[PDB]
Design a protein. Structure first.
Length: 392
């Protein structure tokens, strides 16, 4: 099958970022993953923002109208799917912020059963092609086994629904995973793999506020010359998953569409104090705001890493340029990996400067993307417009 092109659409982008599902270059992707869904102690998966998610009326939504109906970004993603039939959508559950509350439901059968059922309920009501868990991170051995069992719960859940609808489609189950060794070495990766459609390796956040020296935050290869500039590397993670037994073609390489900043720095590998501002939070800048005035951009192709640095303000921002995104595409093809994943859809540029554009083209263009037709039929949906495949 060809490569996957996965992006995350984040619940909250419809606010300050102004990004709605309508303005996704859908022909560029195969999988939109909508983040994030939260979990209750019970195991109950629920929607983080029913305004964004389900209720907001976009242009095109009759306010009035017969039926019990869904709107929000869920209707918009379904409309994206009706128009782009190779575009699948997955509900993504967890996130850095909600992962404190995965361990308690995951430890019991009731909790996992409840997780599986509520997740399926949500998928089949809202028109999703599957679900994606993002538990950062199972912190002990027990939590890891729990994660295999939870995965199993969800795989069994989704499959039962497909059994109930044999003329319809099979459904997806993925996870966002750790590129840091201290986290993935706790995971039972190969047992987990049995349940998953693919893995979205978060091959980023390798350097940031937490560190003492400015580093590369999503570099592919270790700097031999300057070890302190590369505390992690994509490559270590990918070949470690592969020695662990994950098929490479199931590993989708995560790439950031934002950059992490460092203040009071001479440059890469030196100490910094502070991280400055950001586009939305401190120390984090949207790639489409790069490059900032007065910074020179350095591209280190051999380890596939780049950064801007302003010599006067002594500020470093680790982020990928098109040349670097191209080197990343290169690694994906060369190593026969599952494709590219991006966090997150609003921070990218367009046209010739789209990082995603750049990767799809180095993948051989859209013609080399995995052709898997999505699911438009949701017979059991609790929403009438969605159940009826959204007419006008
Ligand atoms: C609390 C909440 O749900 N939303 C917050 C929001 O928190 C976000 C951001 O800080 C994200 N960081 C960004 C946009 O750079 C952060 O993203 C994480 C994400 O959880 C990790 N998991 C993935 N996946 C691929 C699933 O990618 C990584 C990235 C790495 O950056 O996620 C949190 C929620 O976990 O912060 C905003 C302000 O930015 C706030 O309004 C509120 O909506």
């Amino acid at each position: 099958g060809g490569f996957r092109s996965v992006v995350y659409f984040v619940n909250w982008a419809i606010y300050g970022r102004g990004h709605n599902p309508q303005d996704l270059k859908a022909d560029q992707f195969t999988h939109i993953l909508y983040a994030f869904a939260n979990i209750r102690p019970s195991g109950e998966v629920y929607l983080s923002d029913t305004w964004a998610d389900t209720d907001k009326h976009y242009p095109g939504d009759k306010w009035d109208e017969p039926g019990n109906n869904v709107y929000g970004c869920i209707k918009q993603m379904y409309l994206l799917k009706k128009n782009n039939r190779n575009l699948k959508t997955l509900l993504s559950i967890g996130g850095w912020t909600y992962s404190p509350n995965f361990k308690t439901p995951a430890s019991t059968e009731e909790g996992r059963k409840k997780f599986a059922d509520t997740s399926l309920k949500l998928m089949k009501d809202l028109g999703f092609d599957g679900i994606d868990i993002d538990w950062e991170y199972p912190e002990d051995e027990k939590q890891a086994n729990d994660f295999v069992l939870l995965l199993k719960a969800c795989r069994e859940a989704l499959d039962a629904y497909s059994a109930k609808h044999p003329n319809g489609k099979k459904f997806l189950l993925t996870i966002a995973s750790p590129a840091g060794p201290q986290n993935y070495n706790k995971l039972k990766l190969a047992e987990m793999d049995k349940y998953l459609d693919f893995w979205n390796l978060m091959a980023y956040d390798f350097s940031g506020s937490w560190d003492k020296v400015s580093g590369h935050m999503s570099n592919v290869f270790p700097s031999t010359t300057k070890p302190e500039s590369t505390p992690f590397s994509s490559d270590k993670a990918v070949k470690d998953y592969i020695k662990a037994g994950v098929p490479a073609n199931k590993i989708v390489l995560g790439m950031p569409l934002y950059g992490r900043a460092f203040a009071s720095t001479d440059g890469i590998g030196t100490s910094f104090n502070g991280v400055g501002g950001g586009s939305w939070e401190n120390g984090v800048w949207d790639y489409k705001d790069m490059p900032q005035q007065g910074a020179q951009v350095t591209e280190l192709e051999d380890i596939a890493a780049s950064y801007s640095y302003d010599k006067n303000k002594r500020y470093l921002i680790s982020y990928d340029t098109v040349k670097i995104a191209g080197k990343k595409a290169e690694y994906i093809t060369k190593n026969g990996m599952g494709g590219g994943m991006w966090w997150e859809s609003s921070s990218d540029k367009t046209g010739n400067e789209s990082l995603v554009g750049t990767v799809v083209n180095g993948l051989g263009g859209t013609g080399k993307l995995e052709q898997r037709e999505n699911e438009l039929s949701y017979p059991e949906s609790v929403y009438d417009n969605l159940k009826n495949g959204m007419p006008s």
